[PDB]
Write a protein that binds this ligand. Structure first.
Ligand SMILES: *[C@@H]1O[C@H](CO)[C@@H](O[C@@H]2O[C@H](CO)[C@@H](O[C@H]3O[C@H](CO)[C@@H](O)[C@H](O)[C@@H]3O)[C@H](O)[C@H]2NC(C)=O)[C@H](O)[C@H]1NC(C)=O
Ligand SMILES: *[C@@H]1O[C@H](CO)[C@@H](O[C@@H]2O[C@H](CO)[C@@H](O)[C@H](O)[C@H]2NC(C)=O)[C@H](O)[C@H]1NC(C)=O
Ligand SMILES: OC[C@H]1O[C@@](CO)(O[C@H]2O[C@H](CO)[C@@H](O)[C@H](O)[C@H]2O)[C@@H](O)[C@@H]1O
Length: 537
């Protein structure tokens, strides 16, 4: 019998109970601050949600503090929902969040540290005038929330967006202010989309072209593009475009309005929601946090006493081609690497399974690169309108193709009765052009009942002819984060195999295709636990 086999060893999560949306992340005076929607009374959502608070010097090891923002005014008497942090000139962290007032209205409130000499910013004070912003004209009281981090225009005016919808039409309501206290709604929203429902936790920020670095939220220029991110219809979507502060106009590069279809981009194609980023000026990088929901049952959560994880902080930047974003675990995670097991120039015959020995299979960092043999043998399949998730669910690791499925078997039991398969497939259209599919087959991840074992998939934008297909996996008990092609395609999975209660997990490399594939390089590292120190009461 193993105690709490589903808790992670290096992912952020509270000592116990329910946690969802990441809030107000930021770097202040050398300290990384992290906040999050928290229910201090149960392992499920509840009537009283507050901001949990933790600090870190490296984004890996944390110190849990007492909740920072909780009901104290009429403006947030019923709950303190999502918000963002903006460090104003003069070095004051300003927090804008959505509060549920005494009349159950979603309103935007302001708060800031009450003791800037405290490196951990434990105590916060609320602005006497809260709420600072209330639902506009024709917007429902429960469809106006999640203010973003603000950006200061060259005209000295601050901007922020607040999510919501007007008649089921997603909205990124734009507000302006010079003193950060008196805000005025701009005539038109920054962006929007028909019939998408409320836009949750919108994020708007710039990314430097031809650079793998991040930018302060207030930078603008021709060598900069902006990202409009919004959560709706159950997923986080984003679109790259150009921002004209003068006209408060956001023009999507592909000219499309978000539709929540295979036409739009996502940060992650698995369990990933309410993602929020912040700029780290110490390392000139933009860091992204995201809530990773549970996929087990509510009864399971109540029984184990907790629910919700945060994805591991990832650096974020725009690809050299300028058409999509790239994500990668922040370098500080590399410090958790212990012993290493490596493989090179290893052939994987059709229908073969190769076990990787010597690694702590439940807590590891695994990278593998495949060198393909005979691309022309790729199954012919035009994927212009194909839904990659549907395809992955239809063709799991047991569905044998020509090129694919080949990849990893993670959180697998000795006998393989339970396994999580992260793999690729290679296809070609009629004109000989290749496409690459990345799948997270969770269909056999557990023999347990009442577990959402839906699989996830996405197409990887690489040319198999000149690029080996690479895959990195962050394995941490009940969560697996997969990065294909250096972060071009990310998929986060939650799995709950039964075997982990009394036996060790295993790790395998496999190839169930009819074509041979070669492992050119494979690096696996056992990952030690991140430190979580409690400093409360
Ligand atoms: C690689 O592809 C194999 C061929 O599809 C796949 O086979 C597994 O074993 C047999 C076929 O050899 C099949 O299992 C069937 O029988 C069991 C009874 O124990 C049923 O419960 C299953 O539903 C199924 O009818 C399957 O095709 C497959 N087994 C399972 C669990 O589906 C291998 O498993 C594939 N290898 C990898 C690593 O995925
Ligand atoms: C504001 O923050 C400072 C810095 O943490 C607090 O000062 C510490 O207070 C504890 C308990 O009183 C002492 O043991 C430490 O030695 C103090 N350190 C410093 C830097 O002076 C201070 O108490 C906080 N102010 C309030 C009102 O709580
Ligand atoms: O915890 C509140 C936080 O949750 C989000 C997650 O997307 O929205 C959920 O909670 C709201 C308040 O109860 C609901 O109105 C909303 O429908 C639900 O999805 C965030 O939007 C919000 O800040």
């Amino acid at each position: 019998q193993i105690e709490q086999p589903y808790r992670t060893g290096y992912h952020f999560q509270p000592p116990s109970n329910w946690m969802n949306d990441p809030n107000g992340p930021m770097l202040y005076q050398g300290v990384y601050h992290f906040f999050y929607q928290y229910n201090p009374y149960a392992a499920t959502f509840g009537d009283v949600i507050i901001w949990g608070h933790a600090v870190s010097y490296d984004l890996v090891n944390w110190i849990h503090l007492d909740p920072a923002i909780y009901p104290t005014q009429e403006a947030d008497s019923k709950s303190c929902w999502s918000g963002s942090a903006t460090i104003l000139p003069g070095n004051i962290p300003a927090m804008l969040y959505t509060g549920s007032d005494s009349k159950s209205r979603q309103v935007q409130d302001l708060a800031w540290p009450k003791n800037l000499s405290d490196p951990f910013l434990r105590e916060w004070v609320k602005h006497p005038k809260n709420p600072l912003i209330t639902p506009p004209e024709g917007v429902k009281d429960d469809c106006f929330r999640d203010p973003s981090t603000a950006w200061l225009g060259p005209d000295g005016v601050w901007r922020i967006v607040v999510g919501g919808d007007r008649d089921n039409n997603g909205m990124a309501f734009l507000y302006q202010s010079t003193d950060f206290v008196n805000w005025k709604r701009y005539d038109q929203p920054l962006s929007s989309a028909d019939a998408t429902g409320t836009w949750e936790c919108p994020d708007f920020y710039p990314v430097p072209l031809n650079s793998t670095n991040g930018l302060d939220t207030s930078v603008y220029g021709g060598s900069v593009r902006h990202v409009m991110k919004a959560g709706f219809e159950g997923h986080d979507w984003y679109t790259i475009g150009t921002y004209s502060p003068d006209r408060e106009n956001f023009l999507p590069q592909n000219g499309l309005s978000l539709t929540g279809s295979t036409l739009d981009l996502r940060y992650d194609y698995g369990q990933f929601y309410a993602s929020k980023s912040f700029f780290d000026d110490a390392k000139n990088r933009r860091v992204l946090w995201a809530w990773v929901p549970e996929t087990d049952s509510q009864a399971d959560d109540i029984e184990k006493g907790w629910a919700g994880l945060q994805s591991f902080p990832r650096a974020l930047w725009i690809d050299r081609n300028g058409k999509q974003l790239i994500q990668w675990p922040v370098e500080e995670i590399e410090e958790l690497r212990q012993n290493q097991v490596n493989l090179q120039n290893k052939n994987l015959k059709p229908g073969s399974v190769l076990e990787i020995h010597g690694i702590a299979a439940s807590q590891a960092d695994v990278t593998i690169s495949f060198k393909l043999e005979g691309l022309k043998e790729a199954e012919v399949l035009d994927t212009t309108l194909v839904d990659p998730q549907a395809l992955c669910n239809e063709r799991g690791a047991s569905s044998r193709g020509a090129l694919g499925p080949f990849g990893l078997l993670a959180m697998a039991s000795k006998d393989l009765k339970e396994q999580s398969a992260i793999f690729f497939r290679v296809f070609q259209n009629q004109l000989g052009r290749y496409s690459v599919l990345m799948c997270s087959d969770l269909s056999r991840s557990t023999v347990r009942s009442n577990i959402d074992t839906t699989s996830y998939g996405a197409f990887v934008d690489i040319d198999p002819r000149s690029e080996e297909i690479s895959l990195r996996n962050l394995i941490d008990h009940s969560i697996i984060e997969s990065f294909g092609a250096g972060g071009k395609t990310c998929i986060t999975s939650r799995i709950y195999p039964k075997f982990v209660n009394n036996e060790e997990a295993h790790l395998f490399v496999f190839n169930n295709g009819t074509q041979n594939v070669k492992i050119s390089e494979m690096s696996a590292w056992s990952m030690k636990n991140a430190k979580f120190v409690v400093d409360q009461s």
